[PDB]
């Protein structure tokens, strides 16, 4: 097998971990298990402390010009490792030796996943969102020499069995009837979304435009603020339905990050340092942070002045469970 390793700036402290992504099912989150190595005894009595932290960070342009930023620490755990073992920990200890000491953390359920909001050109500092960290420091204050920081990411993956077909309809009297459906409720990243629309128009006035859009809603729970709405991808069609006539069509629309780079505040999957990451995956409600959800809106601009008839369909957008760990880089 292959494990990840990091060393202290002074070099006397080393940390070993087995993974970088920790799946969160309805059951317990995958436990964090690792090893700490103090090769020399420069630590006369000062011991090595291991902390697992979760951080929520938010800031918006208006709040920036006023000067208001929101920072919070949801989860903090500390362990005195230096003072049951899984197979990986025992193999690591056997390979390393006497200095190796194991540490373990258990992430409780109902905690936010790693999410980052797309920074603009002006900000060149830490990104906003929810992130996790594992910090090991030689303290019996935290010194940059002794301490080491490793960024981990709690993630979720698409459920094995999909749900019912998302379908919705409306009627409006002045009547006119609209209905629409989606092929499935779970869509993978980069896969086109196919929507079926059907309209019955019997009023004298006709319809002139049909707009289909994919909207992302990021609910920032803590430090109450309005949610983030964004038209990730839009398709506008010039179609007319005569009175006493019906009209049925199938449209295909695909979200991606190439055209949405200029948008600020767009929710994205957790980044380790700076790597390109796709659009964020819908959170399974089954918390205390950015909750990402996706919907598709179909709108008919009826008549002249005039109004529109709209239908919203919710669908889940995630990744299938992978056999191998994500590289968390650019593969080529």
């Amino acid at each position, epitope marked *: 097998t292959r494990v990840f390793k990091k060393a202290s700036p002074n070099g006397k402290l080393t940390v070993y971990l087995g993974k970088r992504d920790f799946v969160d099912h309805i059951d317990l989150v995958d436990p964090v298990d690792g090893v700490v190595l103090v090769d020399p005894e420069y630590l006369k009595e000062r011991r090595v402390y291991v902390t697992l932290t979760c951080a929520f960070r938010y800031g918006r342009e208006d709040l920036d010009v006023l000067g208001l930023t929101f920072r919070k620490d949801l989860f903090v755990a500390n362990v005195q490792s230096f003072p049951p073992l899984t197979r990986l920990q025992e193999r690591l200890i056997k390979k390393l030796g006497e200095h190796a000491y194991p540490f373990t953390f258990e992430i409780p359920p109902n905690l936010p996943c790693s999410v980052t909001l797309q920074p603009g050109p002006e900000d060149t500092g830490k990104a906003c969102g929810v992130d996790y960290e594992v910090k090991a420091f030689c303290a019996e204050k935290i010194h940059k020499r002794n301490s080491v920081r490793l960024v981990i990411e709690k993630v979720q993956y698409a459920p094995e069995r999909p749900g019912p077909q998302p379908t919705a309809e409306t009627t409006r009297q002045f009547p006119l009837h609209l209905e629409a459906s989606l092929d499935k409720e779970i869509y993978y*990243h980069g896969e086109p979304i196919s929507v079926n629309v059907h309209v019955t128009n019997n009023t004298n006035k006709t319809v002139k435009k049909i707009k289909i859009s994919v909207r992302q809603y990021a609910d920032i729970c803590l430090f109450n603020t309005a949610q983030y709405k964004c038209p990730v991808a839009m398709e506008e069609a010039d179609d007319t339905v005569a009175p006493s006539s019906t009209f049925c069509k199938v449209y295909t629309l695909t979200p991606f990050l*190439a055209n949405n780079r200029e948008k600020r505040g767009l929710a994205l999957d957790g980044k380790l340092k700076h790597e390109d990451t796709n659009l964020a995956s819908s959170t399974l409600l089954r918390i205390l942070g950015i909750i990402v959800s996706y919907k598709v809106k179909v709108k008919l601009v009826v008549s002249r002045a005039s109004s529109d008839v709209a239908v919203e369909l919710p669908f889940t957008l995630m990744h299938p469970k992978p*056999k*191998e760990e994500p*590289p968390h880089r650019e*593969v*080529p």
Partner: single-chain antibody
Amino acid sequence: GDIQMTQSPSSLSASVGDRVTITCRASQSVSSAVAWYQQKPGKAPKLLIYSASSLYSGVPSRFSGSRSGTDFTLTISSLQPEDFATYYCQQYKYVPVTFGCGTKVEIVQPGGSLRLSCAASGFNVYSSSIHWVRQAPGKCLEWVASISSYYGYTYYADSVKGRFTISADTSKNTAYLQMNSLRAEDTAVYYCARSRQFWYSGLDYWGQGTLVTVSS
């Protein structure tokens, strides 16, 4: 620069029923991002092993891969007459894929311009990356260009800069190479390939290469 992926055995006697080993050496550390390919004579390469240990689906459970340092090993425990082809070594950690020299297991003026088209079915340009490679007579595989539309980035090799521009029609699900200036080294067979997005497990699917005879 281009990590030189040297394949030591040029040819092997490889009597049937025997255990055969092929080794690959990299100039720098490419981690475990190494893939193995098999090419029958006059056909497209076929992926065998990715990540240097994982067997691709549909591969008989005889090929094995291993990595100690920068040395990568492909071992076939049982050889059969069906298994007689050329074996290539690739790394996919950096921008140039830098294929390796083959190991054989045996018992139009420059102003001229031409374009090639890829007929891809059941694929999406946003969930896949499209690659263009070429093979000259008696030479290892050469990488020409790559495109990824989800992030919207294209790469070209040093020699094909300015004279090569690849594109993709998303509606027709088609890829184009669009040669403009044809220099001396453009006489080859051109292969069109597809790779996964957000994850690289080798050039899984290959297209029927086209034979081009240009440059006088």
